[PDB]
Design a protein around this ligand. Structure first.
Ligand SMILES: [Cl-]
Ligand SMILES: [Cl-]
Ligand SMILES: [Cl-]
Ligand SMILES: [Cl-]
Ligand SMILES: [Cl-]
Lengths: 276, 276
């Protein structure tokens, strides 16, 4: 695996065909590797980027606190069979004079995570657009854990016409169900025990949906699950349309349950298909 | 030459390399042809788009009356040796659900045209980004007459990483100096006679610059020239830095004289290098 940190070397190290791409912010875990394997198996050349993007971190968030361990990532990727690792510095990605932004507007970015993290999706859209242009991938892989982000990237791709196939990969979970996330390291031993509540709430809703319950009844079951863990401050809990993320008035194939909230030392999010 | 109106036909007809691209809003004139000849000479495959982009027009502007005649444009491009003409409908460029925008921030889009036309450059950046992604050109050609627009496109390309070489082509003018423009068709016979005043003012500033006069002296000469035509209501007249568009206190190579204003039936703009 060749490691590069500049745009110049990146472009020269890239073939024009069969590129599978996996954008990440470093401090990789079992979950990221699932994306890399998927990419490795489907494309002759695999590229993974590691870059903590300042643009998607807003006021009051964890930019400087974000987990960083390049050598650990470089060793993990090298072993995963990745051909190219792009680990640029902030000034390589955003040199002096940088002033362009890409943003998906409307309900897709105004609701849920967009309401809790204003400006977050503009930062994501901007860095993804740039990465797609620098890498020119045939396929790009994203985790379903960040479902809204996945839809935002798909919308930007469809709207602007990027010739990139965006692939969503199922969420990797711990035995107790806690979705893997680099931010889980924030959790203390005690909070980690309560963390499974998000997935628990989501399962409660899927259960009602399977028993023939209404959307409203499913939401109630989910609310109750969360209420049992007051330490968890809920941001939102809903059952939304799989493509528009609008609250559902009735069930539709692919109905998505989404939840988010925060414990004192960290914020967590999760989602799951509740119907059928 | 072949004419296509859908993204599907476009992508299927495009080669992977050697594409020279000229984006336009139609109702072509000799000036557009200069861009086309430049692209034809420097590239094996030439693509021209004709699309009046609603995103770059304001509510009180001329979107509805903008000159349109695809047949005449086709005949012209046919003789010019163009390979592919992309003439999409609004529905094809911006289908239901379209919600993404691209914008260059800062003084570059806030000054001059950006102040007179709020949101104009976001509209330009957005459609150009999309056209670049659909066409995937090696080189894209723009007229220097819309100098600020040329810089904005260059900044977007530089920032996002578009593998596109943006070529600026010198302005084509009538014998009396008026820069050719599709909107010149709005001018009444009497106004057309007074319209050369913008170019005259620019020439007056270059004259002073060439004689060793100061920037301030050059501006006075330009203002005096404009005052000869009271029917012309100036938006701005300045001598600016060629890259930042900031007003100059002293001469620098590439110093650009820029002017814009309105006649009752049409708004005109023009610019010229006044130094050295
Ligand atoms: Cl990540
Ligand atoms: Cl983040
Ligand atoms: Cl045009
Ligand atoms: Cl316009
Ligand atoms: Cl307006």
């Amino acid at each position: 695996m060749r490691t590069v940190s500049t745009v110049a070397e990146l472009r020269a190290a890239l073939p024009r065909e069969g590129v599978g791409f996996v954008p990440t912010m470093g401090y990789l875990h079992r979950g990221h590797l699932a994306l890399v394997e998927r990419a490795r198996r489907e494309n002759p050349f695999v590229v993974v980027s590691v870059f903590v993007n300042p643009l998607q971190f807003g006021p009051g968030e964890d930019y400087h606190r974000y987990p960083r361990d390049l050598e650990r990532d470089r060793a993990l990727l090298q072993e995963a069979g990745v051909d190219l690792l792009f680990a640029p510095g902030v000034e390589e990605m955003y040199p002096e004079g940088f002033a362009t932004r890409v943003q998906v507007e409307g309900p897709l970015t105004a609701l849920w995570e967009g309401a809790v993290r204003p400006g977050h999706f503009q930062g994501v859209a901007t860095v993804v657009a740039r990465l797609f242009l620098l890498v020119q991938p045939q396929r790009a892989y994203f985790g379903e854990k960040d479902y809204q982000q996945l839809l935002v990237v798909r919308r930007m791709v469809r709207d602007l016409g990027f010739p990139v196939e965006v692939v969503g990969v199922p969420t990797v979970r711990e035995e107790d169900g806690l979705a893997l996330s680099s931010r889980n390291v924030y959790l203390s031993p005690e909070t980690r025990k309560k963390a499974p509540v998000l997935y628990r709430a989501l399962l409660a809703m899927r259960e009602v949906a399977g028993q023939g319950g209404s959307v409203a009844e499913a939401l109630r079951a989910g609310e109750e699950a969360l209420r049992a863990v007051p330490e968890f401050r809920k941001d939102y809990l809903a059952i939304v349309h799989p493509e528009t993320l609008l609250p559902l008035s009735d069930w539709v194939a692919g109905a998505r349950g989404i939840v988010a909230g925060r414990f004192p030392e960290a914020r967590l999010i999760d989602n799951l298909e509740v119907y059928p």
